[PDB]
Design a protein around this ligand. Structure first.
Ligand SMILES: N[C@@H](CCC(=O)N[C@@H](CS[C@@H]1c2ccccc2-c2ccccc2[C@H]1O)C(=O)NCC(=O)O)C(=O)O
Ligand SMILES: N[C@@H](CCC(=O)N[C@@H](CS[C@@H]1c2ccccc2-c2ccccc2[C@H]1O)C(=O)NCC(=O)O)C(=O)O
Lengths: 217, 217
């Protein structure tokens, strides 16, 4: 079995857990526990961070036999080439690449707001930016069934995850973009995805670590 | 020719600039200017931001004929594919994808301390962390000529820039890692790169905008 290591929170690893499930991968998990406030003890991880053979010790990590990978996109891409879920055309590939990075940016934005102590007074500002973000995803996907075109790629995994977290942080943000609502439902409707979602392993929340101002619980 | 869109700072776009040179690309640039303090006028870029046909408008952007791309790593992948500068084996691709995301992490960490109002007091703690950042690279590179292995790929462009910026920040941070230093001199030795560096095109400074407590002018 493959081993996925991460905190016991959604974090940035959902697309990975969903990809694992989607490709029917055999894997085990290491969900490292984080210490409560104000210490936020991380020795569950730290006791073995330098003891696992990884080039750049980090969470998440994927152990696949001899191969030891870190950096979530890096992990996503490995699984993707493994199950032919990479773009097939140059245009597929440009779309994917942009999407990949676009998701992480939109994700840091969220993070940066949810770990800042000034959350409360930062939120209304942040809120003003969301409709553009969504519009961008909505006009880019357009009428395509999947973000890269006609077939599911690893980028839909990342895409699903960050829009659902945004949807979750702002429930009515997809109201104006029904193609995005339909996308989440199509993704969600995938056989193995539906399935995992009802599983003992599903882990939707908390979205962040106990250090966050939002979805820390 | 092609067009590269970006502020008139080094920021995160050095790799693209060196890739375009190294590939003998026919490109022109649109270096936008940011007003000064306190205003910090962006109107020069904002007024055409949504009028370029980009899906997710950003800086940098690459216009190559019909193709419009955003997100520095996507741009880099794009040129990588165009000129065959990616890993050719699974192991090279993994190394490449891990390195690509690793650089930007280390990128972020540097920038999170230079666009930090408290730069100077947290500076002494970041410099403490630098020797283990550099050590990971050093150990990862090993005896190899290039980060992926046998030939040059786009991640070397990436690796070179962030190692060069850490180096500028901390001039002795490479003294214990001489192979990193040979990486840098060897990267500077590629003919088209050599030439470019001595050209009117080269922009090695400043790294950041105005609002930074490093590469501030
Ligand atoms: N560029 C890396 C991000 C890596 C990362 O920051 N790893 C964090 C976990 S995600 C982490 C996080 C924790 C809880 C909740 C949310 C997040 C998060 C989400 C997205 C992006 C960044 C953060 C992280 O910093 C960490 O714990 N590293 C191991 C260690 O330092 O020893 C990736 O894409 O894999
Ligand atoms: N993840 C995207 C980052 C995109 C980004 O934030 N672009 C910044 C410029 S880099 C930006 C920068 C600005 C000022 C000074 C320096 C830089 C910088 C330097 C290093 C690293 C990153 C940056 C960003 O903060 C921006 O100005 N976008 C246009 C806009 O939002 O409308 C990329 O990889 O392409």
């Amino acid at each position: 079995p493959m081993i996925l290591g991460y905190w016991n929170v959604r974090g940035l690893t959902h697309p990975i857990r969903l990809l694992l499930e989607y490709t029917d991968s055999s894997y085990e998990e290491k969900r490292y526990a984080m210490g409560d406030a104000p210490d936020y003890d991380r020795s569950q991880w730290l006791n073995e961070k330098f003891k696992l053979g990884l080039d750049f010790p980090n969470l998440p990590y994927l152990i696949d036999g001899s191969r030891k990978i870190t950096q979530s996109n890096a992990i996503m891409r490995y699984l993707a080439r493994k199950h032919h879920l990479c773009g097939e055309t140059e245009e597929e590939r440009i779309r994917a690449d942009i999407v990949e990075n676009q998701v992480m940016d939109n994700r840091m934005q969220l993070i940066m707001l949810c770990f800042n102590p000034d959350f409360e007074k930062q939120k209304p500002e942040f809120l003003k930016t969301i409709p553009e973000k969504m519009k961008l995803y909505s006009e880019f996907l357009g009428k395509r069934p999947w973000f890269a075109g006609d077939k599911v790629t690893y980028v839909d995994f990342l895409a699903y995850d960050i829009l659902d977290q945004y949807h979750i942080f702002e429930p009515k943000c997809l109201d104006a973009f029904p193609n995005l609502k339909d996308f989440l439902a199509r993704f969600e409707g995938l056989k193995k995805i539906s399935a995992y979602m009802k599983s003992s392993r599903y882990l939707s929340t908390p979205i962040f670590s106990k250090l966050a101002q939002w979805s820390n619980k």
